[PDB]
Ligand binder design. Structure first.
Ligand SMILES: Nc1ncnc2c1ncn2[C@@H]1O[C@H](COP(=O)(O)OP(=O)(O)O)[C@@H](O)[C@H]1O
Ligand SMILES: Nc1ncnc2c1ncn2[C@@H]1O[C@H](COP(=O)(O)OP(=O)(O)O)[C@@H](O)[C@H]1O
Lengths: 243, 291, 49, 49, 48, 49, 48
């Protein structure tokens, strides 16, 4: 009752969604029945680890004053005032409504202009957690969703891994190199990403390993492409293409 | 299910949609007013789609920015006004509905019953070489179609082309532009192949504008189906087309007489302010554009 | 027979087709044949779920 | 049977399709001016489609 | 799945019945037009 | 003398009534009937477990 | 110059406009219509 109870103590700390409350409860009851030696016990113990590990309400607090974003932006990138002005407007319209609001955005320009560095600078400006995630040339949609957990060797999709690592419920994801995403006939991830990047459907994101919906609604996705046009039209059309 | 007229979306979204997002941010209207004018301006600019989903995304983004101004920002009660909105969602992007207005010769508007909704894509044409390559020359003034042509568009194009060549010789012998000159023609993509021929009636009027060289009468959208001898045929899916024409500010339209049935199914508010011209033989159309 | 009993009082409430009733009866007979800790017992207990 | 007057150069033709049979029409037409040269000697090349 | 495969799970319908708790719900299959009709066992044929 | 197996095939446009005659024969001879679709199959194990 | 086809239509269009521009400007010259010409656009521009 040790793994179960450290899942329990964190349950006392992090408020899992009530559906996740129930699911972790039945899986917790399942953990004691199994042998430590049983093969399924390993995958389901690691599954419950993967499930409990996810922050559920852990909230790195943001600054919400525009001023502190002003300063911290000027400290680490000279000039390029246009993008600073635009991002300031984006967070101004995010705070204009009240709470943070999602929207997708994209940056594009010559390689090495400083894109990712300002990305991280915003992550420490806003105070949200950072995690870069390149997706150039992939076509294995399973990486974005793991595998069924009944497949040999299944592990949860990348997103769940970033939530386990960044440990906040609301990090700052930074998708990299959207332009070169492997967009093929062999199962186009780019169609699969639409469920991720939809401001509404992230709130119930699910992956093949652990079926239960996750709630990404506070996450701040970002995308970087060397040229914005190669990206398929349905995907390019959602996010703004800042230059 | 059909689409929705632009004005109609206001009466839907103001009741069954706006309150929902208002319940999503947890505010009440007393502190977070959104006038009708802000919504009509919105739909006028950022979303020209028969469905309401895109306007729902816009107003969502605006609302969540208002939530960000509440929960951490300064105001305890954001007060959206139409002049304010461009603050929240930035500057308007699109404005120039109906890009050309004088419609300089050889480009004409055309309705298309696209895969989702309907849109009044223009078709364009122009000369591509000098005409008097040989005063004695007897070579066909070959056309060259472009724009992700389907093969059916190739037969339609030659049909309409030959009909132009016959109408000129029957009408204005002194002109010889068509048989003595090459012409590039471009149909922008978007029409699904099955409806493809319905654009064809637009095509012939394009060329004719180049022929006499006068601009077509302003903002006169049309559609139909040509017979290679000037008889016209019914086209399908008219209601989406007509609402798209309403969205574009069109104030006249021309259809085959065989579709006088379906057009009367439309809601009466849709039919106010138009002046339709049912026709069968093509010659009619020639006298309702040029003279 | 804990899981079997909670699902069986369930069975008593929802009116299962009698065919499916007997089919889950033979399957439950197999579940009695199946081990308490086996990973296949987990697959077939979550099947019972 | 769409056409009824059958304007020249279109003829009916039966076809034992994969399911049933259907009376598909066959059609043809000019693709260039015919009198390209009163002396012209070029094979009137066909283009099947 | 067959339920003998590793990681096997019942088709989506079994889950909708598991969730909705009525025997006579209103299922809403979405976006039927673009269903993948391939050689790998066509679900669109399976839907019949 | 005894009953005998034999193979047979029917073919034609879909919906001509094929499967219905199958069953009519099944209640004609009085043998038990059993449909077995194999359209689109690839599982050799289905033929051999 | 490793042309994309879109440049081909643009090029012939511009060519025809040149052919018109001379005769509209200085008819006595006939250099364009009476001589072959190679023309080279270095690659590097993105197609759009
Ligand atoms: N305005 C700037 N101030 C400081 N460093 C810059 C600036 N612009 C670019 N850089 C540097 O250039 C590099 C570019 O990296 P980055 O934007 O992180 O990814 P990419 O290499 O794809 O642009 C970084 O090392 C960054 O420090
Ligand atoms: N001669 C017939 N007598 C009775 N029913 C027929 C006849 N021909 C066709 N049908 C009808 O055709 C339908 C489908 O026939 P069947 O061959 O059994 O399947 P399918 O035709 O789809 O392969 C049945 O519902 C059946 O009633």
């Amino acid at each position: 009752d040790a793994i179960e109870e450290k899942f329990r103590e964190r349950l006392k700390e992090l408020v899992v969604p009530k559906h996740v409350m129930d699911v972790v409860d039945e899986e917790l009851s399942k953990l004691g029945l199994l042998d430590n030696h049983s093969s399924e016990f390993n995958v389901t113990r690691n599954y419950l680890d993967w499930l409990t590990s996810i922050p559920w309400g852990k909230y790195s607090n943001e600054n919400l004053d525009l001023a502190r974003a002003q300063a911290v932006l000027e400290e680490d990138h000279y000039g390029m005032e246009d993008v600073k002005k635009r991002i300031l407007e984006f967070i101004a319209v995010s705070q204009l409504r009240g709470s943070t609001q999602g929207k997708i955005l994209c940056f594009y320009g010559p390689p090495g202009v400083g894109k990712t560095s300002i990305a991280r600078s915003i992550a420490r400006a806003l105070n949200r957690e950072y995690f870069r995630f390149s997706v150039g040339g992939m076509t294995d949609v399973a990486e974005i969703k793991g595998h069924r957990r009944t497949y040999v060797g299944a592990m949860p999709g990348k997103i769940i891994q970033c939530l386990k690592k960044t440990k906040t419920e609301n990090p700052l994801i930074l998708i990299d190199e959207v332009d070169k995403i492997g967009r093929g006939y062999q199962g186009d991830p780019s169609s699969a990403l639409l469920e991720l990047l939809d401001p509404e459907q992230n709130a119930n994101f699910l992956d093949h390993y652990l079926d239960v919906p996750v709630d990404l609604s506070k996450v701040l996705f970002i995308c970087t492409a060397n040229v914005t046009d190669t990206i398929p039209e349905p995907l390019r059309d959602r996010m703004e293409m800042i230059n | 299910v059909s689409g929705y007229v632009a004005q109609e979306k206001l009466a839907i979204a103001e009741r069954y949609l706006v309150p929902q997002a208002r319940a999503l941010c947890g505010l009440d209207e007393s502190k977070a007013k959104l006038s009708s004018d802000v919504l009509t301006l919105l739909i006028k600019q950022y979303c020209r789609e028969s469905g309401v989903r895109n306007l729902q995304k816009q107003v969502e983004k605006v609302l969540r920015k208002s939530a960000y101004k509440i929960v951490s920002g300064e105001a305890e009660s954001v007060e959206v006004t139409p002049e304010n909105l461009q603050d929240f969602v930035g500057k308007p992007v699109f404005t120039v509905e109906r890009m050309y207005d004088v419609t300089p010769p050889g480009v004409v508007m055309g309705l298309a019953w696209t895969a989702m909704g309907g849109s009044t894509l223009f078709v364009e044409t122009s000369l591509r070489r000098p005409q008097d390559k040989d005063a004695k020359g007897d070579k066909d003034g070959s056309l060259e179609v472009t724009g992700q042509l389907g093969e059916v568009m190739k037969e339609s194009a030659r049909i309409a082309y030959t009909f132009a060549r016959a109408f000129l010789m029957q009408h204005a012998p002194a002109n010889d532009y068509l048989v003595t000159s090459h012409i590039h023609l471009h149909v922008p993509e978007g029409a699904t192949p099955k409806d493809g021929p319905s654009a064809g009636c637009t095509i012939v009027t394009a060329l004719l504008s180049l022929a006499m060289g006068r601009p077509v009468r302003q903002n006169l959208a049309m559609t139909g189906e040509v017979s290679l001898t000037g008889k016209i045929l019914p086209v399908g899916g008219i209601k989406e087309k007509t609402i798209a024409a309403k969205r574009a500010g069109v104030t006249c339209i021309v259809l085959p007489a065989e579709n006088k049935k379906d057009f009367y199914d439309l809601a009466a508010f849709i039919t106010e302010g138009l002046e339709v011209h049912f026709v069968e033989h093509y010659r009619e159309i020639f006298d309702i554009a040029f003279p």
